[PDB]
Write a protein that binds this DNA or RNA. Structure first.
Ligand code: SAM
Ligand code: SF4
Ligand code: MG
Lengths: 126, 400, 19, 78, 100, 86, 29
RNA sequence: GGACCUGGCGGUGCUUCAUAUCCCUCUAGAGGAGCCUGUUCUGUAAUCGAUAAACCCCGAUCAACCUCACCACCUCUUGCUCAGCCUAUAUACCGCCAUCUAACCCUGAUGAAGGCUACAAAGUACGUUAGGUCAAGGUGUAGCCCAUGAGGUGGCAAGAAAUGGGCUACAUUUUCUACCCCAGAAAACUACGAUAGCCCUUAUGAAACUUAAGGGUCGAAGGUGGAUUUAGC
């Protein structure tokens, strides 16, 4: 009355912070560019950015975790973790489409390695 | 809407367009960076020689921040309403009410806290009051005050500004403060920061309670950062009514440039405009000389505030290096009737200059806020130049 | 390029193969 | 695993072969588990052979209650 | 479809710088030797001046390739500090780790 | 040809054929996009040059009335155009 | 479906399961 | 009205000390000049922001053109996108930072209530702000839309101070040379000292007094600077 009376689940990658990148986490993309003496780091980085945007737009709501972009010689492996929500026929169609389109866009033999999980692999609750 | 494309024209009286540049157009009211009188700064530093250590910096900063973020004392009716909502949603209500409400305390200004308040607010108050007085001085150069009062005259800042502006005509400086320490501080500052000496300004009268005689009307009555200290709306109402009754020519009211200060000054403005006295000794009506170009309710009270700024050089101290800006709200109420019907919009916000266009927020005489983007092609070369040179707190001379 | 990259998204979304 | 869950003839052959003769108790329990799984494959969608064989298998494995429940389905499907 | 007008202006500059590079080099080579007569060096100063102003290799800026930021650009990645830190903190830049 | 993931491994002959047909249809859609808009895939970055990863051109380039354009249309197996030009 | 690692004998020919470089498959390892 | 229980104390004083920050003391420097670099006003046709206060060697690990988003005119218009706006709005939200404000068991006669001793005696288990920020960390909304959009060519005035930061000195524990620590000269006015001014070469560039390096000329003030301030570990 009178005044004086008054008086979220996270995956393993999400759980760990950027300063654990070489201690507990790894690197999502692997290539030779950033090594001492090597060339074309910027080209690989731009390729990585486009690959991530393209995959996230071509597999909407399927990717359970981040992509892993591996590079061996001339090859380009997109190792992704997806859900078991979309039907397998659509997964095969999208894999074929993505392989062909990325192979012709980067002029290299791209290849996808989908791994399905039932649901987001929760590590803790931040 | 006091700015119509192609219809409104710049207001040319006394041939300011022909006989003067555009930078010297009548509606400019900017004040150069304020520097306090050397006597005042010397007195402040001398009085603060006793203790000006690292503790004083923290204390000054805390006092300034608190006096800024402080809210109005909450009236009982609002508390009852909030309590009702709390019970309907539900000691638990009283705790939830302790939170979501501001704890307002009376500030007991003893000697130490008065020293802190001096060191934290003398310069700012002087700057604000100086700009407020400059408003009257610039718009009516013929007015020569002889009598001044200062409610809550804690440091005499109003007295110093009144001297600085009208020292060749003022002869009486009534100062009122319940705080005896603070009266003593004001006297010491006026005597060069020394307990024994000669006052710099002649004719000062210090007091603790207001004058009593009804027939006495003072030309200028000022209250700067003082009404926000009163504990209740009833106290604020009675104080404002008394000041208006004893106002002869101008009542100047200044507060912190927050929503709190704007609301307080608008309540005072509306009280003074809507006269209740059945047969006052002074029958003269009262109007808003500045900064409002009308008498209707503010278009900015609903959710926003209305403030002004004045930049000034702080008193040299261990923590005061760069020039500062004081943000304050003001209102000047004058007895009688408006001088003419050609009143000009007021800029209540920083003018934004951009290539070939100028954003200006105007409070127009019709009683509305107009957010104008002035450009030469749409509004006129002279008007665009006037807009380009006008800034926060100025008057834009447009007619019809 | 930023034309190849941006207009390829435009074509892909219009064909309904990208979100 | 190869998608033949919903083939009737295969179920029929398996149940008949399983219920043909009397087997040691371990294999009887195993055949009872298989018969229960065939039962569930049916409920997830009734030849008299499959019904009778499932009943006999549950009986031989000692799961008397489920056989007595099967007695209801015999009457239900005529 | 570049990031903004400023990036497009710099893409325009880099195009003409490539087209005019051989001619600029040759005309510039005549003026950087104390052998040929001064009559010829003085004219190549006129020939080089008349070439379109954007063809000059000194008017090209290393803006970021993703945000067109004019400064704070690491040339090895062509990425401004804000965009680099975003990718490096997510472990999307191979080999990059925070120092200890 | 299939993927080792349990959710994507075909379980039946019909399912295996269906998955293969879906994959081939996706490849065909990608090929259609690539050939329909070569301008987005002409930028070559591969050393040595890979001819099999470049867009294919199915349109006549010679437009005049001449025997060489006829031979071009015959090389492209464009029957109706070849008859019309003959 | 169940992983195929359940069907792998303890004396199989491992090189045939991973003939070339491939990413880790939990249902195959 | 008698006896008792929990208290709180939203209260004080004193005593000893552990008493780290903050003090105090102690050590070693800088502070007064000449420059530059931000910023303040002023001045100017002439970037911006930093909106109460506490964070300018700030955005910028770099400004001749460009960068550039500022000014003078000139010049184009469905325009790199099909537009485009460094135009406004976080005084629209969102990110961000900031200001302020249990269960069990025993005892008391089964009362409020209480429960420890180790050479062991009942205890075990937020809200707020006419806040900042669009170098967007975001999403929207308002405007301009033959120009709040493009483009071109030139120009951002500078002397009064007020500050911060840095550099360089005022020398003899110094300066030059050899050398890299056993030498020879110079030395207070032809001593030291200028990253002060002016002139000439070299580098880069299309364009250099206008940016940098060196040489010449020059040899200014400076003569160690209190109150203060910077670190210590
Ligand atoms: C703190 S000063 C405000 C600043 C001052 N006006 C200045 O210019 O520096 C306001 C003073 O008003 C005084 N005051 C409070 N209530 C009052 C009242 N009812 N009548 C007169 N003075 C009052 C307080 O003692 C307080 O010191
Ligand atoms: S917005 Fe206009 S009417 Fe309101 S306080 Fe300000 S000047 Fe006065
Ligand atoms: Mg412009």
């Amino acid at each position: 009355r009178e005044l004086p009376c008054a008086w979220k689940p996270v995956t393993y990658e999400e759980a760990h912070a950027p300063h654990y990148i070489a201690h507990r986490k790894g690197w999502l993309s692997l290539h030779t560019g950033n090594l001492d003496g090597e060339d074309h780091a910027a080209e690989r980085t731009v390729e990585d950015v486009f690959l991530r945007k393209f995959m996230w737009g071509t597999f909407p709501g399927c990717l359970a975790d981040q992509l892993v972009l591996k590079r061996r010689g001339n090859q380009l492996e997109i190792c992704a973790v997806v859900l078991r929500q979309l039907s397998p026929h659509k997964y095969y169609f999208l894999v074929g489409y993505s392989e062909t389109l990325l192979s012709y866009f980067y002029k290299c033999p791209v290849r996808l390695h989908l791994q399905t999980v039932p649901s987001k692999v929760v590590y803790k609750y931040l | 809407a006091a700015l119509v494309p192609g219809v409104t024209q710049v207001d040319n009286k006394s041939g300011f367009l022909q006989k003067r540049p555009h930078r010297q157009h009548p509606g400019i009211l900017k004040l150069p960076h304020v520097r306090l009188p050397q006597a005042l700064a010397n007195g402040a530093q001398l009085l603060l020689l006793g203790s000006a250590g690292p503790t004083m910096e923290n204390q000054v900063q805390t006092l300034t921040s608190y006096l800024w973020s402080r809210h109005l004392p909450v009236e009982p009716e609002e508390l009852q309403r909030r309590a009702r909502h709390l019970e309907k949603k539900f000691g638990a209500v009283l705790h939830a009410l302790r939170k979501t409400t501001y704890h307002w305390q009376e500030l007991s200004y003893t000697e130490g806290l008065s020293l802190v308040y001096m060191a934290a607010r003398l310069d700012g108050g002087f700057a604000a009051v100086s700009r407020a007085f400059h408003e009257i001085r610039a718009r009516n150069p013929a007015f020569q005050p002889q009598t001044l009062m200062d409610f809550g005259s804690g440091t005499g800042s109003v007295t110093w500004a009144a001297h600085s502006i009208w020292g060749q005509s003022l002869r009486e400086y009534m100062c009122v403060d319940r705080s005896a320490a603070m009266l003593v501080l004001a006297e010491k500052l006026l005597k060069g920061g020394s307990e024994s000496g000669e006052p710099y300004i002649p004719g000062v009268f210090f007091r603790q309670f207001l004058p009593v005689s009804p027939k006495v009307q003072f030309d200028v009555v000022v209250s700067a950062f003082s009404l926000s200290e009163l504990p209740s709306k009833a106290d604020r109402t009675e104080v404002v009514q008394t000041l208006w009754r004893k106002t002869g020519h101008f009542l100047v009211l200044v507060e912190n440039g927050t929503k709190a200060g704007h609301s307080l000054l608008m309540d005072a403005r509306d009280l003074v405009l809507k006269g209740k006295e059945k047969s006052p000794l002074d029958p003269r009506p009262g109007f808003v000389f500045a900064p409002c170009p009308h008498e209707l309710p503010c278009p900015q009270l609903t959710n926003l505030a209305c403030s002004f700024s004045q930049a000034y050089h702080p008193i040299p101290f261990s923590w005061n290096k760069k020039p500062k800006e004081e943000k304050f709200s003001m209102v000047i109420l004058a007895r009688g009737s408006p001088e003419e019907a050609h009143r000009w919009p007021r800029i209540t916000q920083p003018v934004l200059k951009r290539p070939r266009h100028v954003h200006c927020h105007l409070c127009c005489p019709d009683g509305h806020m107009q957010h104008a983007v002035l450009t030469a092609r749409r509004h006129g070369r002279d008007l665009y130049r006037c807009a380009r040179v006008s800034s926060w707190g100025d008057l834009l001379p447009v007619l019809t | 390029n930023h034309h190849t990259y941006a207009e390829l998204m435009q074509t892909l979304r219009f064909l309904g193969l990208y979100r | 695993e190869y998608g033949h869950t919903f083939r009737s003839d295969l179920r029929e052959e398996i149940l008949m072969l399983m219920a043909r003769d009397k087997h040691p108790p371990e294999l009887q329990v195993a055949f009872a588990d298989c018969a229960a799984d065939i039962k569930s494959a049916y409920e997830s969608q009734w030849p008299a052979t499959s019904l009778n064989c499932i009943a006999i298998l549950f009986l031989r494995a000692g799961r008397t209650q489920e056989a007595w429940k099967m007695l209801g389905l015999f009457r239900k499907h005529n | 479809h570049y990031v903004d007008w400023r990036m497009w202006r710099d893409v325009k500059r880099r195009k003409m710088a490539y087209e005019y590079a051989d001619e600029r080099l040759r005309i510039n080579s005549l003026r950087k030797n104390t052998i040929l007569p001064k009559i010829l060096q003085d004219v190549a100063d006129e020939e080089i001046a008349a070439l379109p102003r954007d063809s000059c290799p000194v008017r090209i800026r290393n803006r970021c390739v993703m945000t067109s930021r004019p400064r704070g650009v690491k040339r090895r990645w062509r990425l401004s500090r804000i965009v680099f830190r975003h990718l490096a903190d997510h472990g999307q830049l191979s080999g990059i780790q925070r120092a200890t | 040809v299939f993927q080792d993931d349990p959710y994507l491994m075909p379980a039946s002959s019909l399912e295996s054929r269906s998955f293969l047909l879906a994959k081939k249809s996706g490849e065909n859609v990608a090929k259609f996009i690539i050939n329909s808009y070569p301008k987005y895939f002409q930028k070559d970055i591969a050393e040595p040059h890979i001819p099999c990863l470049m867009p294919e051109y199915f349109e006549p380039q010679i437009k005049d009335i001449s025997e060489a354009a006829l031979k071009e249309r015959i090389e492209l197996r464009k029957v109706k155009a070849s008859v019309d030009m003959f | 479906l169940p992983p195929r690692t359940e069907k792998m004998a303890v004396d199989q020919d491992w090189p045939s399961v991973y003939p070339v470089a491939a990413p880790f498959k939990p249902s195959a390892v």
